[PDB]
Amino acid sequence: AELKMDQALLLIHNELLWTNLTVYWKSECCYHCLFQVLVNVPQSPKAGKPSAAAASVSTQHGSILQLNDTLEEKEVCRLEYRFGEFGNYSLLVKNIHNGVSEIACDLAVNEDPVDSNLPVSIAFLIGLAVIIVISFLRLLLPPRLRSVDTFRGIALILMVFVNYGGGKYWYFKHASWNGLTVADLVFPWFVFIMGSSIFLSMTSILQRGCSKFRLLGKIAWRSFLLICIGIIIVNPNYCLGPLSWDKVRIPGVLQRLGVTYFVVAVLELLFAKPVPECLSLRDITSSWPQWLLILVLEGLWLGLTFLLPVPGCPTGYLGPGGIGDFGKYPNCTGGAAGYIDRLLLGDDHLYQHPSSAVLYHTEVAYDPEGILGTINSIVMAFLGVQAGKILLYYKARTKDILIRFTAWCCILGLISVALTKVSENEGFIPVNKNLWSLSYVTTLSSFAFFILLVLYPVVDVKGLWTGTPFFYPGMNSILVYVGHEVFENYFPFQWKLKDNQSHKEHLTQNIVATALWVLIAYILYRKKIFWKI
Template sequence: MAWLLERSGRDEVANLDTNQLGIDEAFLTFDLGNRSQAWLYTLSEDCHKCPFELNSKIGHLESNVTKISTKHAWTLLLTESDEGLFVKNSSSKICELQASLGQFGIYNVKADKCKIDVISKPVNIYAPLIAVASLLVLIGVILGFISSVLNYCRKKQKFEPDRESSKPENNVQRRRVSSLDTFRGISILLMIFVNDGAGGYQILEHVTWDGLQLADFVFPWFLWIMGVCIPISVKSQLKRKSNKFLVLISIFKRSCILFGLGVMLNTLGVGPKLETLRIFGVLQRFGILYFLTAGICTIFWPTNLKTTGRFLDLRTLFPQWIVHLLLHAAHLLIVFLYKIPGCPTGYFGPGGISENGLYVNCTGGVSAYLDKLILGGQTHLYQNPTTKFVYKTGPFDPEGPYGCLPSLLTVFLGVQAGAILLLYKKSSERLVRWFLWGAVCLVSGFAISIIIPINKNLWSTTFSLCTSGSAFLVLVLCYILIDKISLWNGAPFLYPGMNATIMYVGHMVAYQLWPWHWSFGRMDTHLILLVEALWGVGLWTIIAYILFRKKFFLSI
């Protein structure tokens, strides 16, 4: 079982105790040949366009062993003299080599030959992930089969929760699309899993700056799903209230509740210290984007909604498309034309030590600069962004106020999906349009990424397109399995998807509370961290199922 427990079974190798290593750590030893000392500089592949950073001094009089992280590959540089904290081009280089290291491995760097020998092989950190994922899939298949057999024996139709109250004009009652709740549930459980550490797996966490990893899809998927629901909600409210002003008041109230709830959650663990309170965050962005997108949708929603004709969805949303395209064009003009003191226009970089510190105070470009102007400084920004630890930057808020402007595109692409759901009754019509929108968004997003990088922190245009494109395709898959061929009822994701607000707020409040979280021993393997994270996800799923059975659904 050593392969599963991530331990080789040998605690001491080459006089080194591997029990001293933490998760994602390895030992580096050095053979300097005839040299008495050297300086080790390191450069992580996660730090783009960065200089080498001093790691340690090694030699006969100092320790010739150092610990090093294995989360990313490294470029190692050995020099004959101390060249300062950072160095771009060494004048006393002994050796420079690439190193992809593994957890609990022991390696020896031979300076004369400029190569790395493996003294003790690393463990396979992905074995627990594969084993646990396979087990969960197997359990899901078994439970699904049992559920199908029971339903067949009882000769009942698949239960479809929370039926929509509005009826089409032919008086045939339309059911709520369960795949949408399931998609929302997938997003909320994935978010809880990531926030609980994702088992310590770097590939499941947020990317530091440019690029996309699994965790980066969660937030935009949520916003996109909110957008899907907006035209359905607006149509329903206009039918009940028959007054757009009253609908706008209702939208404003909900937005204020979301924003206030987000600010309240920002005080968890730090207290309500007003002079340093982080004002913006996840729910705050939800509130602002809901107000803007739902408000625009309400204002421009046609009084006499047509239900026939070609390009029905585009004709219905045409005025809204014009508004949103103008808003996004304004964002791009600001990004590429607004001049920031000491920074180039159109800067998308992380600043800090990137590019040898040339733009040290330009992290996030115009987005961060305007956030500081709006909030009167950086004390109300997020103080510990990922860039702080990799690029040595200052505070930066990935959910800052300016980021709401480019994020509108994500929500409105969800509105487009919602309009298709609302205006087209046949499954084939919906699926074809969702698939085409998904393909177009993905292709255009990756194509434009040559100019505008895919970046969650800045919520770049390409990030909106790629994440929204993936959302279209995920909805297509869920819709086929759940609503079209009824091969799956959406469980267990359906249940948390119908109480997403409780799930989000609850897991934030209970972040360090038992029984959702616990520790045992050193917690120094991916297996134990993975079990702990999935334990919390499982408990919240059970809570969501209980609420579902009690027919308790919280809606703000």
């Protein structure tokens, strides 16, 4: 068996004679949430014959159990415990007779749980062993930037692993409302890299002599293709049935990239300047028209998020709704960000399975790729432009590039510390992928500037590493992204599992499927088949 993944068996024995017990369950990860009923345990009919009730408790995080007298609505005892996967626990509720009439509840482990993260530890050990063997085996025996392809390839490899299931591990899934996991990293990085490629390609194109009007037509064609491919190809689940307009999801990943690419590229094209040939600020001062408009857009996001009144909803609400925030705003998932989507697009055209629907039991439709959060996608893509400006403005001096990448990583990291208050749920603006919050952008941009700080001198300047095998997917990013959406259910990326409730079998299937997309992109590289939108 009755146990599923990340579940343990809990047996409650009620030795009390005149007390009915209701067991409530709360997860320690669920912030300011309500207790949910777990199981009702009746009173013991006779002394020495305890009443037994069974329940399944989630073991992904810590569990908080509250046992309340049903008749008197009074708390009997409170229990905090972290259960283990496929464990068998017994909770005995008996009244101690050592001079008092109090009730003491204790928990016993009938059968020990299993190590849930053992496959992940073994997979990391196996992967590290392969790298060492390959490294030791060989010891005995305008140009395209390789570090940008390597950094894009890393995000593509992480994308396929987590989109295909991630081993069904909670830290390889999206966070419910607040915080960061491994799955919440790749999308901002793709926006960061896309902005860098905007400046790198535009500078070379305009240098050779292409006109701005002809380049404006190329920007609009690429944006149109990205939006159309997302709505028609990527978004729908055609296994359910033929497409109907009433159930078409308008927002999405490629629609966000298409709108973000258009705004940033047009902004860069409109105020484009030639790149001139230590203490200089010429990559920032020369682009002050963009910066002034970017901070005006950022003020609009802050103004609508914290000041726009949402009917039947608090102003500036940043919680998930549902049973969160003590269940006072069940239909307020997203605050003003979700209100704008429901008002402009309607619930039928939004994303129907938000990540908060499991931990906070939200009922309304929220789209993480909403309208309001597109402002912060432009901010993230404009920080990629700054990364591409440092590379080209100071190409001659490697030390100049490294100094600028360190200053931006440190400054953007300091803003995140003040905004998040180094906390998951506290702070002025908590990190939130669903809202695409400001501290989400500054945190992931700080990571992106640090990755370039390490990848650029290792891969591009010194050449100690060629980026293998990451740069092969990085040169066919659209083929890999569109490919794994179309062929998600196909063999050999997916096959029937002997045990659907096993972390080991899910992880092995997802690792093999990810390694096949790296191999597919390697064959395309060897055959010189590259597709660009």
